[PDB]
């Protein structure tokens, strides 16, 4: 009878009437739309300053080495910026901000919006419009869960099961908002913070309103349909459907081996400063200007990545530049993401996979010339590849890389190519890296307490 | 030290090896494999009788009342063999399917393959088959559920997170082998499935094992690219969105008004012959019948509904003609699935929101000729609105709509309809359909033990 009072716990869940607070559902398209606004803010003037740093590169066109001195120190003092800010006023500002969103679900993060969000806008704003190799996925999903937590202080609502709805509204409407992605903003939340959110009919009701208007709000000031603006590339034939399977066992292995990476780049850049701040902005502005630099000479190496993935799916790079491109594309990830700028590491690890996709695909196409492939529809398929090795969140990776593709008969080949980079992923002995960084960022904290 | 004590469980559970068996992510590829195979085989044997029921219309078409008597009879003779399996040999596969899987998984039904497994496949080539107003998702789901612990049973494996793994398995299978649609399969598992589905790293793997391995199977035999073949419609603009929060708040108050009229059927119906088996068999023959005979006089009322659905999104019917489909499909969708026939209630929802879209959207184009509308992206986005507020799985219902009409450019009308269909069927007391008869089978249960 140990599953017959079980059954009796289960018929008093029907005849319970679910309520429907309408309080937390109106302040979600209050945060929704207040996240919606400071994403594009956030992307108007970060594209605003690369766009200023380039108009001053055309001046001095002639005279080509003040051109490279104003590559480096228009970069430089713009993330030195960055780093001051992160590193006086809002610590938790740094890096990502996903692993601080998460651990503020879990109640272990402070949210500090009166001094995170104008440090995660302006720091991040000067960061990645400097030219630095980090996306703006990161700082737009701490911006969103940090304006949630404004919201519910403004009105001064209470209670702990609000506090968690309106932190997982802004996290889920700063993705919606950050890439045009409504549908992986709320698969953000119940697949990637699966073991953070608390999945309430209201609740996840909320999340589906502060992405609406989080959309709604992108879709004012932008006009495109593809984030990433790649073509309409071929379908992929059942004979060729076991390539993506190897291309994911490829990303599976090299994913854990990026992880730690990325975890022995944050203790090896540690050691330069040691935690002073005279030397981590000095820091800051010798990676940051170099990216700037890299941003003019050899400009694929550095930056986001939005500017290089549309024109790796076409076949304009070769064998030899791929290569040049991923560890050169390797090693700026890890000076900009690990040694603590403002900015995250989605973006970056998009063109990634890309420029890894796109290797695979010359590689198939000429050792398989009987199955009409395409270099293309792999690079889409790697993309979402890297975010299932190292993100290991492979469902709101893939939907991701289909919305700001508009590539959806791909579904299939994706799912085979996540599935395989999650499998060699746990197998080899990874973990996520929002997960792994949470977890040094929590064992830190339990340091300092002794 | 109430939070101190749990960050020290958030960093040992970080340290954990995570614990890969491969053993049950190759027992997913043999059920994926199985339930794709099984469900082509429905797919293929429904469609075999319903050819073959037309072609005997054709044959004898000079005799008009012999011709209603063959349409009667054939679709009869066919309804009783499906009504008396299930009375004989398998009560519970009786239905959709779904609410008998969804107990299986929280360990409240069991799972008897031997039985259900030859009634569902049999018993439901004779209700689809016969023009019976029912979807094939419930029946691939309970034949995907049962194929998956009759994988179990064979190979013999201990546990009983290997047993909910298989099992949620070919759930999942069952719905991707059904209607091409893989990333709506996943879906089925943790967020239509959430309360009842335990997550794992490895259980979500094998999820997308038998998904993969389901949607290939499929695809080796089906080379549509769409189910549903309506053409590329058109986006919706922003000043339009309003409209579809408006069909998804009507749907949203129909869904709960829909709900009780098939838990009110059902126990109608169930006055006529109660629990006989000779009057249960003539019954379902004399619903089956009228199904075979509508098929032939007005067509549009009657059958699974996949038919219905791109002559509706297309404008071909009249506003009356639409209003008199809404109707006497509402009657036989009653008729049918209430009286425990073998068959879903998915596809005969599909049809009854693309017809009250359809509706909603020639009402927006006469009201409303300045945003430029078209009346079919209300009909698919009315058309997982009635999933919404009914079976109140809108992520579920919106990518299958999406994977089946492959109109992905009303991503976020869709999620704004799935919102206020989910939003106003809680307001207005409703339930999930699966969870509100799964209930009352597990109530029933109780009665039955005093
Ligand atoms: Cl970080
Ligand atoms: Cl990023
Ligand atoms: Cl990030
Ligand atoms: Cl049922
Ligand atoms: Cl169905
Ligand atoms: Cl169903």
Same mark, same amino acid.
């Given at each position: 009878?140990?599953?017959?009072?079980?059954?009796?716990?289960?018929?008093?869940?029907?005849?319970?009437?679910?309520?429907?607070?309408?309080?937390?559902?109106?302040?979600?398209?209050?945060?929704?739309?207040?996240?919606?606004?400071?994403?594009?803010? /956030?992307?108007?003037?970060?594209?605003?300053?690369?766009?200023?740093?380039?108009?001053?590169?055309?001046?001095?066109?002639?005279?080509?080495?003040?051109?490279?001195?104003?590559?480096?120190?228009?970069?430089?003092?713009?993330?030195?910026?960055?780093?001051?800010?992160?590193?006086?006023?809002?610590?938790?500002?740094?890096?990502?901000?996903?692993?601080?969103?998460?651990?503020?679900?879990? @109640?272990?993060?402070?949210?500090?919006?009166?001094?995170?969000?104008?440090?995660?806008?302006?720091?991040?704003?000067?960061?990645?419009?400097?030219?630095?190799?980090?996306?703006?996925?990161?700082?737009?999903?701490?911006?969103?869960?940090?304006?949630?937590?404004?919201?519910?202080?403004?009105?001064?609502?209470?209670?702990?099961?609000?506090?968690?709805?309106?932190?997982?509204?802004?996290?889920?409407?700063?993705?919606?908002?950050?890439?045009?992605?409504?549908?992986?903003?709320?698969?953000?939340?119940?697949?990637?913070?699966?073991?953070?959110?608390?999945?309430?009919? !209201?609740?996840?009701?909320?999340?589906?309103?502060?992405?609406?208007?989080?959309?709604?709000?992108?879709?004012?000031?932008?006009?495109?349909?593809?984030?990433?603006?790649?073509?309409?590339?071929? @379908?992929?034939?059942?004979?060729?459907?076991?390539?993506?399977?190897?291309?994911?066992?490829?990303?599976? !292995?090299?994913?854990?081996?990026?992880?730690?990476?990325?975890?022995?780049?944050?203790?090896?850049?540690?050691?330069?400063?040691?935690?002073?701040?005279?030397?981590?902005?000095?820091?800051?502005?010798?990676?940051?200007?170099?990216?700037?630099?890299?941003?003019?000479?050899?400009?694929?190496?550095?930056?986001?990545?939005?500017?290089?993935?549309?024109?790796? *799916?076409?076949?304009? /790079?070769?064998?030899?530049?791929?290569?040049?491109?991923?560890?050169?594309?390797?090693?700026?990830?890890?000076?900009? /993401?690990?040694?603590?700028?403002?900015?995250?590491?989605?973006?970056?690890?998009?063109?990634?996979?890309?420029?890894?996709?796109?290797?695979?695909?010359?590689?198939?196409?000429?050792?398989?010339?009987?199955?009409?492939?395409?270099?293309?529809? /792999?690079?889409?398929?790697?993309?979402?590849?890297?975010?299932?090795?190292?993100?290991?969140?492979?469902?709101?990776?893939?939907?991701?890389?289909?919305?700001?593709?508009?590539?959806?008969?791909?579904?299939?080949?994706?799912?085979?190519?996540?599935?395989?980079? *999650?499998?060699?992923?746990?197998?080899?002995?990874?973990?996520?890296?929002?997960?792994?960084?949470?977890?040094? *960022?929590?064992?830190?904290?339990?340091?300092?307490?002794?």
């Amino acid at each position: 009878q140990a599953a017959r009072l079980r059954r009796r716990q289960l018929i008093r869940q029907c005849l319970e009437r679910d309520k429907t607070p309408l309080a937390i559902l109106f302040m979600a398209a209050v945060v929704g739309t207040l996240v919606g606004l400071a994403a594009v803010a /956030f992307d108007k003037g970060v594209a605003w300053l690369q766009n200023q740093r380039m108009g001053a590169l055309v001046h001095t066109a002639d005279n080509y080495p003040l051109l490279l001195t104003v590559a480096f120190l228009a970069s430089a003092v713009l993330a030195m910026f960055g780093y001051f800010l992160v590193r006086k006023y809002a610590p938790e500002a740094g890096g990502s901000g996903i692993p601080e969103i998460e651990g503020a679900l879990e @109640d272990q993060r402070p949210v500090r919006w009166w001094r995170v969000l104008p440090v995660k806008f302006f720091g991040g704003l000067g960061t990645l419009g400097g030219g630095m190799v980090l996306g703006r996925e990161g700082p737009t999903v701490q911006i969103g869960g940090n304006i949630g937590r404004m919201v519910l202080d403004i009105f001064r609502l209470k209670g702990d099961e609000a506090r968690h709805t309106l932190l997982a509204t802004g996290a889920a409407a700063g993705l919606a908002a950050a890439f045009n992605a409504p549908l992986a903003g709320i698969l953000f939340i119940i697949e990637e913070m699966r073991p953070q959110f608390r999945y309430t009919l !209201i609740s996840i009701k909320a999340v589906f309103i502060g992405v609406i208007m989080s959309t709604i709000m992108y879709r004012i000031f932008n006009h495109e349909v593809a984030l990433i603006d790649v073509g309409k590339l071929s @379908d992929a034939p059942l004979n060729t459907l076991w390539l993506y399977l190897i291309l994911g066992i490829i990303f599976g !292995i090299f994913g854990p081996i990026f992880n730690k990476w990325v975890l022995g780049m944050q203790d090896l850049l540690h050691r330069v400063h040691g935690g002073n701040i005279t030397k981590w902005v000095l820091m800051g502005g010798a990676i940051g200007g170099l990216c700037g630099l890299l941003g003019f000479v050899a400009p694929a190496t550095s930056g986001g990545g939005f500017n290089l993935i549309p024109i790796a *799916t076409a076949g304009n /790079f070769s064998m030899g530049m791929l290569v040049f491109i991923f560890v050169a594309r390797v090693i700026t990830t890890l000076l900009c /993401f690990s040694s603590g700028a403002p900015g995250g590491i989605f973006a970056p690890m998009l063109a990634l996979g890309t420029v890894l996709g796109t290797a695979f695909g010359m590689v198939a196409v000429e050792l398989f010339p009987q199955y009409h492939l395409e270099a293309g529809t /792999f690079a889409i398929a790697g993309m979402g590849a890297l975010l299932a090795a190292s993100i290991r969140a492979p469902l709101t990776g893939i939907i991701l890389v289909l919305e700001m593709t508009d590539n959806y008969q791909l579904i299939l080949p994706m799912i085979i190519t996540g599935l395989g980079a *999650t499998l060699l992923a746990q197998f080899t002995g990874g973990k996520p890296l929002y997960s792994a960084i949470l977890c040094r *960022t929590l064992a830190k904290q339990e340091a300092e307490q002794l």
